[PDB]
Nucleic acid binder design. Structure first.
Lengths: 94, 81, 132, 108, 107, 108, 94, 81, 97
DNA sequence: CATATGCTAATGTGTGCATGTGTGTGACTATGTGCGCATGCATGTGCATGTGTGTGCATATACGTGTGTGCATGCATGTGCATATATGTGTGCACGTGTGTGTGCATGTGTGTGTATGTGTATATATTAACCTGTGTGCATTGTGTGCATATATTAGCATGTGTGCAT
DNA sequence: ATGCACACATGCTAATATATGCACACAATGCACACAGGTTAATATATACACATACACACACATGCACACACACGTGCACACATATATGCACATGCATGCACACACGTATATGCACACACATGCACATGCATGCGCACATAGTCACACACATGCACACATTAGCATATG
């Protein structure tokens, strides 16, 4: 059947940052592993944050707090900025 | 609160901690080094605990915030909830 | 400088203590030997008390005598309890001023003298002949 | 209906917002997921991917390569202090190590 | 001059270096109480926290948990540091011992 | 109906099977929880509690104490190989350390 | 309000293993923390096991495999025996 | 399959040490390294086989190994997880 | 005949193997070892080739990191040759004991 | 017998030459690097397609806001005394040096085992479809668990004896 | 072997932290009931294993030796120990605020379900970049030969101190 992965999105990002640079299949697998790992870490932290506060929904606030908990200083600041900007643009465009 | 409270961790206290660790002889440069290490450790835990406190929209750091921060760092602590 | 007069004063007092303690100069050398190990002959003590020795030697024997006079005052009982060879060697000179060790051994065996004794005597013969 | 616009294009993102939302829903994280949570998470994932890919592309360009291989990802991660902290307990397959010889071992 | 010999011998005698250290090792490995004074540690915690949020409050049990964790961390680090010092055929821990222990631990 | 009896008594356990089931259901672990899963988990938790408590009671008796304190729990955990492995990254408050002096530091 | 803990069940277990031994409040708190920690570890492992195998139910099989993964050897064997015995008795009685 | 630990040869262990930056190796290192690798492989393979049993499979997959490594805090990238 | 002094080609190999990324253990003996170890847990066990490759990658990464820590321990003791006690100390500090 | 002399064995201080060792500066030798040319497979582009996501209402409910309450935190005040600190001393530990040995490195050689290719078979993994049993939902019943008070046994604080180990 | 300092053992009081009990309320249970996830039987295919072959490179073994390490020794200074003084921690109260929690209402939002399309994935070539190989440049390593330094020994240059005999 169909095995979903992040390969096409990673390729789009790579073309955004390095239009003339390709990527090998093993490197693509490593990038897919990295995306899944970071997703699992952030989602687990946000789930625990919702549980600690007796909340049943995971919102962008929980994601922001999980990102701050899991990421080192400058990475956390820049990731929080990107997430906030994306959420603002999304709600501005419904 | 105050300023420069790292000196409050006195040389006898560091010596007692080293004795509990089974250390027989301590060089004079250890204490300062120890202080730095402690500060780093605390800076890593408190920063996380406050983050938890900030998420709950509280102004008081609770024991549970510290416990969650310690668990987040792989240093789970029993006896405070 | 004034070390000369300080030595002289020490030596006069040393003579006074030696005469007061009833010790002969040979006995002084014996005591120095049995308390330090470097036994000295009574000629050295004579030349000291008369201030005949050289300045370096003067300073060298100052400390030993200082220690002896400062220590012996406590208890005394336990502390108390040839020409033909010359002529032959001169004959051996006037022909070979500096003989080899091979000849030196023969000379030593011939006149019954120790090898080191003959070697040092040969060196001093050369020394006094080179004086003039 | 109006023309169907993907939530990723609405949020200005390359990573899939809808797929992230579905994975959050079926991942057993909470019984409800907010509308902005998948958007925030997809944006964060895209940012981290972009950082790593930029560093790895620079590493590949340094080695006169046009294609990123695991070695370039390893060099990018380990040479960056923050990424190295984030991935400190992660092994990258076929990545090798960083060239490092202790100065005491060098000849004098 | 005067006379040699002379006493001056510092008669006062004491315990040998390391005997009291071993006694303190046994004493503090037998007990469980906190070895850092509570008030200075609380002041240090508040001073460090003031850099993250202004006008923070702390539950007493929060500071107690912080102190328990800090002392456990430091004691374990000192155990590792002692192992590193003994590895170098020494009995005195030095800052390089702490640095090596923290490097190996991944800190 | 019939006189209600807890699932703990049905399973012959002291730990609360119903509470474990509720904690599993509301803990966001899976969409559904089987009937035997809370029973199994409660039995395992009760067994581990019994092991640690019996070792800690032995440690308290060795100290002529009738009440278990954190020191006894710490001694029981650290003197047991498997329990020490299970709680390797765990700090027990007011537990202290094991008496252990390296032989090189002992007097000659 | 009411705060839930394992203190009473830990006390019953203690009275069975050591009928004449008490426990201090701090030690009871530590026991509660231990029970919660082991519960969270086992339940998280079982949840991951269910997700890996494309299942939506946590069953006693997932719990048993999580116990085998998380507990060291002899502890794991005895825990598996206890859990199997409890499930067998529960099924035989209901 | 009997006594396959000696298949981890001295040159292979030396190459692994060279990648680790080691300049000089004592002759007793090789047996200790073989024991260490044997213990590591036991732990990982035991967890991977447990994952294989739970799936009711008889083939150890790459995902089983990846999950086993992740459980031990040794996350590996590049094999589907 | 030319002879490099001790430690010269050792440093050459350090540079060579820190420049490369290929596996350093032979694949077939490692596969045999993996199957032998897995026999003690099950009989008639089959392995995906990618599973054995993942195991080898993890094993080599673990051993290389251990050798780095062991080298640090050896240098700490003012030596340049790693010894079994260095490995034991590194594993004890790491908590792998 | 004990001092003063003349005199010379004996040692002691200094050059220094000559020799041996260690060092330093640049030919061979080996190895890693950098183009240059040719190949293969592996990456990237282009299509069917079917599955998952977007759209649209309709419903439920979780959470955010607002109010009121009581805990509990921070601050100030006061206390004795246990602890920290600065000082002086001496010891034994760390470090530096020197050395001898044997262990480990570099190298050469013969081989046998790993590697890559190729094949085929069976075993097992994955997929599909019917079904059925176990689990979620909802609601009433109520029995268990928790919070708030008592009552007490255990633990903590001293005072003398008791070995117990250290250090001269 | 004896003296001294320290941790422990028996015993007695005192309190505070734990064990037990009663009331209420909330979550666990019991009982239908619906439904979908999981089970099971059959089947199609993927792929792992087992064997077979040739080849060549890496591994194993033996050799020669260099330098790293372990041991020994000397030393100086850093740190342990003891002491006298003073600081500030611990305790203990008491007060006021402020903030964390409870509770309730009511809406914004997440879910649910059905449909429709377009996005992502499997499959298919196409080509071009990474790899492989032979040549040549190109960096570094290691004697080599020499040069400089340092020892020592040893020769030679001064001082030194004891003998035989002279005084006395």
């Amino acid at each position: 059947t169909r095995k979903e992965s992040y390969a096409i999105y990673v390729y789009k990002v790579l073309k955004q940052v390095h239009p003339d640079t390709g990527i090998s299949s093993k490197a693509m697998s490593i990038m897919n592993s990295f995306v899944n790992d970071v997703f699992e870490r952030i989602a687990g932290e946000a789930s625990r944050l919702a549980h600690y506060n007796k909340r049943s929904t995971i919102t962008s606030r929980e994601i922001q707090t999980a990102v701050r908990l899991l990421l080192p200083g400058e990475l956390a600041k820049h990731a929080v900025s990107e997430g906030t900007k994306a959420v603002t643009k999304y709600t501005s465009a419904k | 609160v105050l300023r420069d409270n790292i000196q409050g961790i006195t040389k006898p206290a560091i010596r007692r901690l080293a004795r509990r660790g089974g250390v027989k002889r301590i060089s004079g440069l250890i204490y300062e080094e120890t202080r730095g290490v402690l500060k780093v450790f605390l800076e890593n835990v408190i920063r996380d605990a406050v983050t938890y406190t900030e998420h709950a929209k509280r102004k008081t750091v609770t024991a549970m915030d510290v416990v969650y921060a310690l668990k987040r760092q792989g240093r789970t602590l029993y006896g405070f909830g | 400088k004034a070390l000369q007069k300080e030595l002289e004063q020490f030596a006069k007092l040393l003579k006074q203590k030696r005469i007061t303690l009833g010790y002969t100069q040979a006995d002084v050398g014996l005591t120095l030997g049995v308390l330090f190990g470097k036994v000295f002959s009574q000629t050295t003590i004579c030349r000291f008390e008369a201030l005949q020795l050289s300045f370096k030697n003067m300073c060298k024997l100052r400390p030993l005598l200082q220690k002896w006079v400062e220590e012996a005052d406590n208890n005394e009982n336990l502390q108390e309890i040839e020409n033909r060879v010359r002529g032959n060697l001169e004959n051996l000179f006037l022909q070979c001023p500096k003989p080899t060790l091979q000849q030196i051994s023969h000379i030593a065996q011939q006149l019954g003298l120790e090898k080191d004794v003959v070697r040092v005597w040969f060196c001093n013969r050369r020394q006094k002949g080179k004086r003039s | 209906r109006a023309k169907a616009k993907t939530r990723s294009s609405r949020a200005g993102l390359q990573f899939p917002v809808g797929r992230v939302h579905r994975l959050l829903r079926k991942g057993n994280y909470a019984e409800r997921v907010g509308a902005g949570a998948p958007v925030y998470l997809a944006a964060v994932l895209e940012y981290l991917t972009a950082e790593i890919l930029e560093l790895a592309g620079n590493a590949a360009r340094d080695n006169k390569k046009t294609r990123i291989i695991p070695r370039h990802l390893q060099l990018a991660v380990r040479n960056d202090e923050e990424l190295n902290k984030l991935l400190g307990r992660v092994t990258i397959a076929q990545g090798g190590v960083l060239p490092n010889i202790q100065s005491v071992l060098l000849p004098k | 001059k005067s006379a040699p010999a002379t006493g001056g011998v510092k008669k006062p005698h004491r315990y040998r270096p390391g005997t009291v250290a071993l006694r303190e090792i046994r004493r503090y490995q037998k007990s469980t109480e906190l070895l850092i004074r509570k008030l200075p540690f609380q002041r240090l915690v508040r001073e460090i926290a003031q850099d993250f949020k202004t006008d923070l409050r702390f539950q007493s049990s929060a500071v107690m948990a912080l102190q328990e964790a800090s002392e456990a961390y430091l004691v374990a680090l000192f155990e590792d540091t002692n192992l590193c010092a003994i590895h170098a055929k020494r009995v005195t821990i030095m800052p390089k011992d702490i640095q090596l222990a923290r490097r190996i631990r991944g800190e």
